[PDB]
Design an enzyme around this catalytic site. Structure first.
Site, PDB file in Angstrom:
ATOM      1  N   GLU A   1     -47.053 -16.159 -96.335  1.00  0.00           N
ATOM      2  CA  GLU A   1     -48.238 -16.119 -95.486  1.00  0.00           C
ATOM      3  C   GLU A   1     -47.967 -15.339 -94.193  1.00  0.00           C
ATOM      4  O   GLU A   1     -48.885 -14.652 -93.704  1.00  0.00           O
ATOM      5  CB  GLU A   1     -48.762 -17.514 -95.168  1.00  0.00           C
ATOM      6  CG  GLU A   1     -49.243 -18.279 -96.404  1.00  0.00           C
ATOM      7  CD  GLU A   1     -48.134 -18.932 -97.170  1.00  0.00           C
ATOM      8  OE1 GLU A   1     -46.988 -19.130 -96.633  1.00  0.00           O
ATOM      9  OE2 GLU A   1     -48.427 -19.246 -98.348  1.00  0.00           O
TER      10      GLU A   1
ATOM     11  N   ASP B   1     -67.602 -24.272 -96.293  1.00  0.00           N
ATOM     12  CA  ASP B   1     -68.008 -24.837 -95.004  1.00  0.00           C
ATOM     13  C   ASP B   1     -67.201 -26.106 -94.813  1.00  0.00           C
ATOM     14  O   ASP B   1     -67.515 -27.154 -95.397  1.00  0.00           O
ATOM     15  CB  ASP B   1     -69.509 -25.149 -94.993  1.00  0.00           C
ATOM     16  CG  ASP B   1     -69.972 -25.768 -93.687  1.00  0.00           C
ATOM     17  OD1 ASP B   1     -69.131 -25.915 -92.772  1.00  0.00           O
ATOM     18  OD2 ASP B   1     -71.184 -26.099 -93.584  1.00  0.00           O
TER      19      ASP B   1
ATOM     20  N   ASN C   1     -55.788 -27.505-100.286  1.00  0.00           N
ATOM     21  CA  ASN C   1     -55.940 -27.130 -98.895  1.00  0.00           C
ATOM     22  C   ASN C   1     -54.552 -26.701 -98.364  1.00  0.00           C
ATOM     23  O   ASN C   1     -53.539 -26.781 -99.078  1.00  0.00           O
ATOM     24  CB  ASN C   1     -56.581 -28.291 -98.115  1.00  0.00           C
ATOM     25  CG  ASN C   1     -57.199 -27.898 -96.780  1.00  0.00           C
ATOM     26  OD1 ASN C   1     -57.184 -26.745 -96.361  1.00  0.00           O
ATOM     27  ND2 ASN C   1     -57.787 -28.896 -96.105  1.00  0.00           N
TER      28      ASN C   1
ATOM     29  N   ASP D   1     -66.328 -21.285 -93.274  1.00  0.00           N
ATOM     30  CA  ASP D   1     -65.377 -21.077 -92.183  1.00  0.00           C
ATOM     31  C   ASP D   1     -63.950 -21.452 -92.539  1.00  0.00           C
ATOM     32  O   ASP D   1     -63.090 -21.557 -91.652  1.00  0.00           O
ATOM     33  CB  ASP D   1     -65.806 -21.874 -90.945  1.00  0.00           C
ATOM     34  CG  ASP D   1     -65.836 -23.384 -91.169  1.00  0.00           C
ATOM     35  OD1 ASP D   1     -65.456 -23.879 -92.248  1.00  0.00           O
ATOM     36  OD2 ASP D   1     -66.255 -24.103 -90.223  1.00  0.00           O
ATOM     37  N   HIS D   2     -63.661 -21.604 -93.827  1.00  0.00           N
ATOM     38  CA  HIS D   2     -62.352 -22.074 -94.232  1.00  0.00           C
ATOM     39  C   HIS D   2     -62.024 -21.564 -95.649  1.00  0.00           C
ATOM     40  O   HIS D   2     -62.806 -21.727 -96.549  1.00  0.00           O
ATOM     41  CB  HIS D   2     -62.298 -23.595 -94.166  1.00  0.00           C
ATOM     42  CG  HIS D   2     -60.914 -24.173 -94.327  1.00  0.00           C
ATOM     43  ND1 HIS D   2     -59.864 -23.746 -93.602  1.00  0.00           N
ATOM     44  CD2 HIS D   2     -60.432 -25.169 -95.162  1.00  0.00           C
ATOM     45  CE1 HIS D   2     -58.772 -24.432 -93.972  1.00  0.00           C
ATOM     46  NE2 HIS D   2     -59.126 -25.308 -94.908  1.00  0.00           N
TER      47      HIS D   2
ATOM     48  N   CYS E   1     -55.678 -19.889 -92.578  1.00  0.00           N
ATOM     49  CA  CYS E   1     -56.119 -20.460 -93.867  1.00  0.00           C
ATOM     50  C   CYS E   1     -56.275 -19.395 -94.941  1.00  0.00           C
ATOM     51  O   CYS E   1     -55.904 -19.618 -96.090  1.00  0.00           O
ATOM     52  CB  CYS E   1     -57.434 -21.259 -93.703  1.00  0.00           C
ATOM     53  SG  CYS E   1     -58.787 -20.358 -92.982  1.00  0.00           S
TER      54      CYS E   1
ATOM     55  N   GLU F   1     -44.140 -18.926 -89.505  1.00  0.00           N
ATOM     56  CA  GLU F   1     -43.909 -19.206 -88.083  1.00  0.00           C
ATOM     57  C   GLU F   1     -45.098 -19.867 -87.390  1.00  0.00           C
ATOM     58  O   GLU F   1     -44.930 -20.544 -86.374  1.00  0.00           O
ATOM     59  CB  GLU F   1     -43.566 -17.909 -87.352  1.00  0.00           C
ATOM     60  CG  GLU F   1     -42.297 -17.256 -87.863  1.00  0.00           C
ATOM     61  CD  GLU F   1     -41.947 -15.986 -87.128  1.00  0.00           C
ATOM     62  OE1 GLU F   1     -41.735 -16.038 -85.904  1.00  0.00           O
ATOM     63  OE2 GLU F   1     -41.894 -14.931 -87.786  1.00  0.00           O
TER      64      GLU F   1
ATOM     65  N   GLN G   1     -50.487 -24.843 -92.598  1.00  0.00           N
ATOM     66  CA  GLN G   1     -50.784 -23.672 -91.750  1.00  0.00           C
ATOM     67  C   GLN G   1     -50.484 -23.986 -90.262  1.00  0.00           C
ATOM     68  O   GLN G   1     -50.404 -23.065 -89.454  1.00  0.00           O
ATOM     69  CB  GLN G   1     -52.235 -23.181 -91.903  1.00  0.00           C
ATOM     70  CG  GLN G   1     -53.286 -24.145 -91.440  1.00  0.00           C
ATOM     71  CD  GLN G   1     -54.652 -23.638 -91.720  1.00  0.00           C
ATOM     72  OE1 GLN G   1     -55.144 -23.764 -92.844  1.00  0.00           O
ATOM     73  NE2 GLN G   1     -55.279 -23.071 -90.727  1.00  0.00           N
TER      74      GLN G   1
ATOM     75  N   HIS H   1     -67.283 -29.884 -90.698  1.00  0.00           N
ATOM     76  CA  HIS H   1     -67.770 -31.238 -90.414  1.00  0.00           C
ATOM     77  C   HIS H   1     -66.624 -32.190 -90.287  1.00  0.00           C
ATOM     78  O   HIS H   1     -65.610 -32.058 -90.967  1.00  0.00           O
ATOM     79  CB  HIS H   1     -68.721 -31.720 -91.497  1.00  0.00           C
ATOM     80  CG  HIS H   1     -69.891 -30.834 -91.658  1.00  0.00           C
ATOM     81  ND1 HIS H   1     -69.869 -29.753 -92.465  1.00  0.00           N
ATOM     82  CD2 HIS H   1     -71.134 -30.842 -91.038  1.00  0.00           C
ATOM     83  CE1 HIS H   1     -71.040 -29.115 -92.376  1.00  0.00           C
ATOM     84  NE2 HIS H   1     -71.822 -29.789 -91.514  1.00  0.00           N
TER      85      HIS H   1
ATOM     86  N   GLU I   1     -51.011 -28.410-113.859  1.00  0.00           N
ATOM     87  CA  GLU I   1     -50.358 -28.875-115.069  1.00  0.00           C
ATOM     88  C   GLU I   1     -49.642 -27.790-115.865  1.00  0.00           C
ATOM     89  O   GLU I   1     -48.732 -28.086-116.642  1.00  0.00           O
ATOM     90  CB  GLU I   1     -51.373 -29.560-116.003  1.00  0.00           C
ATOM     91  CG  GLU I   1     -51.953 -30.829-115.423  1.00  0.00           C
ATOM     92  CD  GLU I   1     -52.881 -31.569-116.365  1.00  0.00           C
ATOM     93  OE1 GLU I   1     -53.457 -30.952-117.288  1.00  0.00           O
ATOM     94  OE2 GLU I   1     -53.041 -32.788-116.161  1.00  0.00           O
TER      95      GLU I   1
END
Ligand SMILES: *C(=N)C1(NC(=O)[C@@H]2C[C@@H](S(=O)(=O)c3ccccc3Cl)CN2C(=O)C2(c3ccc(I)cc3)CC2)CC1
Length: 219
Positions: free
Chosen positions: A50, A137, A186, A162-163, A25, A92, A19, A140, A9
């Site tokens: 990135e 994590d 994300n 892991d992310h 990530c 890329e 990605q 899942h 905002e």
């Protein structure tokens, strides 16, 4: 802290990116945090590269499309003296030779801050700093197929992240019992989740380790 925060905002957050099939990530988490801090400093929102981080931050410990750490990305920017714009150094989704050009540097940092490993500390940071890089994590299938609402996964680990993603705010639903969330950007495109965002469970025992490895750059 305010009861709700949403840095989108206030102009701190670029559109959701994708990605692709590269394990980058961490780079998107890092650019998102630095986009926020540069906007705070200059009043200009400029999308950052990135690819520059994927190609060039090996010396600091990152592993290109095989993973990396936001803190190593922030160290690279400091060591390097700059980071190119997205426009100048497009994404890329494959690791390539380093093509950093200082002429197109649009961001800097002077280090980074690791936040204490508690959700209360994370809330104070989000309220006062801007968007924050966090580890979760995400391993899942419930996360892969997340669509809407507050994400809660009983088997989530607070230790096994892991992310790398970006917390852009927090708030609460008015519907019923456990209604607080972190607003998380994300890097899986706008198609995933709620326009590329996931409202993640907040104040539920550090769910998915969201407060376990949170940080931001200093500028
Ligand atoms: C993103 N596409 C992928 N995940 C990673 O690169 C993640 C990012 C970070 S993290 O956010 O999970 C994390 C975890 C623990 C402490 C701090 C942080 Cl920031 C690291 N990632 C990992 O998957 C691991 C890792 C750690 C260090 C390196 I160098 C490379 C990879 C395994 C933890 C690639 C899927």
């Amino acid at each position: 802290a305010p009861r709700s925060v949403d840095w989108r905002e206030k102009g701190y957050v670029t559109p959701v990116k994708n990605q692709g099939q590269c394990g980058s990530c961490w780079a998107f988490s890092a650019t998102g945090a630095l986009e926020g801090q540069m906007f705070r400093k200059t009043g200009r929102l400029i999308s950052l590269s990135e690819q520059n981080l994927v190609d060039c931050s090996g010396p600091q410990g990152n592993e290109g499309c095989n993973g990396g750490l936001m803190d190593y990305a922030f160290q690279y920017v400091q060591d390097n003296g700059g980071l190119d714009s997205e426009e100048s150094y497009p994404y890329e989704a494959t690791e390539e030779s380093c093509k950093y050009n200082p002429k197109y540097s649009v961001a800097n940092d002077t280090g980074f801050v690791d936040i204490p490993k508690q959700e209360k500390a994370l809330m104070k940071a989000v309220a006062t700093v801007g968007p924050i890089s966090v580890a979760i994590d995400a391993g899942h299938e419930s996360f892969l197929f997340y669509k809407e609402g507050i994400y809660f996964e009983p088997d989530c680990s607070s230790e096994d992240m892991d992310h790398g993603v970006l917390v852009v705010g927090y708030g609460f639903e008015s519907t019923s019992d456990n209604n607080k969330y972190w607003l998380v950007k994300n890097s899986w495109g706008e198609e995933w989740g709620m326009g590329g965002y996931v409202k993640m469970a907040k104040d539920r025992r550090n769910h998915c380790g969201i407060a376990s490895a949170a940080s931001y750059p200093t500028v």
